[PDB]
C-alpha cells in the first residue's frame, strides 16, 4: 500500500511534469482534492477533475507549463519548479501562526492543514491559525 | 538514518584526544632532564637535532626539543617545557622554553628574541 | 582562649534535665492509666488520665512539649483509654472523656 498518499500524489505530479505529460491520475481522496483546490487556485495546475478508472475513482490533474524556449533544450519552463512534502509520516511537522514559513520570500506557497481547513501560508497567516505543514511548492 | 533510529541510537559526539598530555591541562610543565642526546630526522631532511628526555612533575617522562643555536643543558638541568611539536622528529611533541631555570637564552640573538628567551641588547 | 557563649551550653544542660524530667513523668503516668483501662478499673484510670492530660498541657506551656505534638499525645491517650474501657464498660468517674 501507499505509506504516504499525499507525498505519492506530489511525486506523481513531479514525475509527470518532468516529462511534460498532459495530465496525471492520482487515487482520489478528499484530502488530495482539497490540496488540488489550492494548487489550481494558485495557478500551479490548469485544474483537476474527478474521473473513473476501471472500477475506482481517480483525480486527473491537468498540468501547466510555460512557453517553448529558444536555443538548445527548447523544453518549456516548468510552472512547478519544486514541490516537496514536509510533514511526513514518522516525522510530522506542526507550526504555530508565528512559525509559518515565507516560501521563496513570497514567490512560493506553503500548504497548511489547520483547524479551519486546508489553507496556504498567506491564507493561514491572514486567518491567524497554524497546523500541519503539509508541503512547500514554488 | 531514519528519524526513528535517531530517537533510538542518537548522534555520537566526537571527543578530541589531547595532543599534549602535559597533565592538569597546564600550558607549561616543569621537569628535570635525564639525557641530552642527538637524534636524526626522518626521510626528507638530515641534521643533528638536540633533544632531551625530561622527567616531568606531571608524572611523565617524555622527550622534548631544545631550540636555538646553542644550549647549555646537562644531566641534572631543570627546565620548563611547553607544547608544540617538531614534525621531522617522530616522538617529540614538546619544546623547551629557553630562558627558564637552567636554559640560557640563545646568545647573539637579534631578530626573534622573545621566542628564544634573549633580553633586549644595550645602548644604540 | 574561647568565647563565653559556653554559657549557652550550660543553660542547655539545665533545660535538658528540665525537659527529660517532665516527659519521663508524662509517659510513666500514661502507661499507668492505660494499665488501669486494660484491667477495667475505670474510676482510677480516668482519675489518672486527668493528671496525665494536665501534665501534658503544663509541659506544653514551655518549650518541653510544645505545639500540637501535645494534642497528639492527648488524643492517643484518650482514644486508647476509651477503647480499653469499652472492652469492660462503666466509665465511672466521668472525667476527661465526654459523655
Amino acid at each position: 500500500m501507499l505509506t504516504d498518499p499525499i507525498a505519492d500524489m506530489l511525486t506523481r505530479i513531479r514525475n509527470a511534469t518532468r516529462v511534460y505529460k498532459e495530465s496525471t491520475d492520482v487515487p482520489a481522496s478528499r484530502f488530495k482534492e482539497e490540496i488540488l483546490r489550492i494548487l489550481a487556485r494558485e495557478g500551479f495546475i490548469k485544474g483537476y477533475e474527478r474521473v473513473d478508472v476501471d472500477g475506482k475513482p481517480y483525480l486527473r490533474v491537468y498540468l501547466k507549463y510555460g512557453p517553448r524556449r529558444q536555443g538548445p533544450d527548447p523544453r518549456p519552463e516548468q510552472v512547478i519548479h519544486h514541490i516537496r512534502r514536509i510533514s511526513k509520516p514518522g516525522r510530522r511537522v506542526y507550526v504555530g501562526v508565528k512559525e509559518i514559513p515565507r516560501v521563496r520570500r513570497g514567490l512560493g506557497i506553503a500548504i497548511l492543514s489547520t483547524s479551519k481547513g486546508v489553507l496556504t501560508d498567506r491564507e493561514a497567516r491572514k486567518l491567524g491559525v497554524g497546523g500541519e505543514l503539509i508541503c512547500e511548492v514554488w | 538514518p531514519t528519524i526513528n533510529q535517531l530517537v533510538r541510537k542518537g548522534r555520537e559526539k566526537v571527543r578530541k584526544k589531547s595532543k599534549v598530555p602535559a597533565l592538569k591541562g597546564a600550558p607549561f610543565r616543569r621537569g628535570v632532564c635525564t639525557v641530552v642526546r642527538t637524534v636524526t630526522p626522518k626521510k626528507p631532511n638530515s641534521a643533528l637535532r638536540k633533544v632531551a628526555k625530561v622527567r616531568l612533575t606531571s608524572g611523565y617522562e617524555v622527550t622534548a626539543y631544545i631550540p636555538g643555536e646553542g644550549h647549555n643543558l646537562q644531566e641534572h638541568s631543570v627546565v620548563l617545557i611547553r607544547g608544540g611539536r617538531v614534525k621531522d622528529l617522530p616522538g617529540v611533541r614538546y619544546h623547551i622554553v629557553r630562558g627558564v631555570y637552567d636554559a640560557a637564552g640563545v646568545k647573539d640573538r637579534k631578530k626573534s628574541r622573545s621566542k628564544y628567551g634573549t633580553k633586549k641588547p644595550k645602548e644604540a | 582562649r574561647n568565647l563565653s557563649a559556653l554559657k549557652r551550653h550550660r543553660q542547655s544542660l539545665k533545660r535538658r534535665l528540665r525537659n527529660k524530667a517532665k516527659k519521663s513523668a508524662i509517659k510513666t503516668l500514661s502507661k499507668k492509666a492505660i494499665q488501669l483501662a486494660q484491667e477495667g478499673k475505670a474510676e482510677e484510670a480516668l482519675k489518672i488520665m486527668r493528671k496525665a492530660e494536665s501534665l501534658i498541657d503544663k509541659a506544653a506551656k514551655g518549650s518541653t512539649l510544645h505545639k500540637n505534638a501535645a494534642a497528639r499525645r492527648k488524643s492517643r491517650l484518650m482514644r486508647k483509654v476509651r477503647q480499653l474501657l469499652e472492652a469492660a464498660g462503666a466509665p465511672l468517674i466521668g472525667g476527661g472523656l465526654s459523655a
Binding site: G90, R91 | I3, V7 | -
Partner: protein, 99 residues
C-alpha cells in the same frame, strides 16, 4: 491543581493497591517526532474496587506510603485486557536477552 492522569490497571496483586500505567505523547526536543513514553504509578484502591484491565483516572494525593502517592479518582472504562496483554508481552520479552 492536583495532577490527574489516565491509565490502565496492570497489577492487582497487592493489598489495597493497583499499578496504573499511564502513557503520554510529546514531540522529541530535537527530532520533532511525536514519541510515546509511559510510566507506572502505584495508586491507592482502599476498597479493592478496581481490577485488572480497568482504565481509570488517577489524582495526586497525600502520600499513602513510599512509592505510593496517588489515588484512583474514577473508572473511565471497564476491563480491556489488550493493553494489559501488551504490557505483559513487553515484560516477558526481557527473559529472552540474558546471556
Amino acid at each position: 491543581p492536583k495532577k490527574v492522569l489516565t491509565g490502565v490497571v496492570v497489577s492487582d496483586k497487592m493489598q489495597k493497591t493497583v499499578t496504573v500505567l499511564v502513557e503520554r505523547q510529546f514531540p522529541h526536543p530535537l527530532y520533532g517526532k511525536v514519541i510515546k513514553r509511559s510510566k507506572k504509578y502505584l495508586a491507592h484502591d482502599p476498597e479493592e474496587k478496581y481490577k485488572l484491565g480497568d482504565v481509570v483516572e488517577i489524582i495526586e494525593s497525600r502520600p499513602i506510603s513510599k512509592r505510593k502517592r496517588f489515588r484512583v479518582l474514577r473508572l473511565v472504562e471497564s476491563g480491556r485486557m489488550d493493553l494489559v496483554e501488551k504490557y505483559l508481552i513487553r515484560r516477558q520479552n526481557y527473559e529472552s536477552l540474558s546471556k
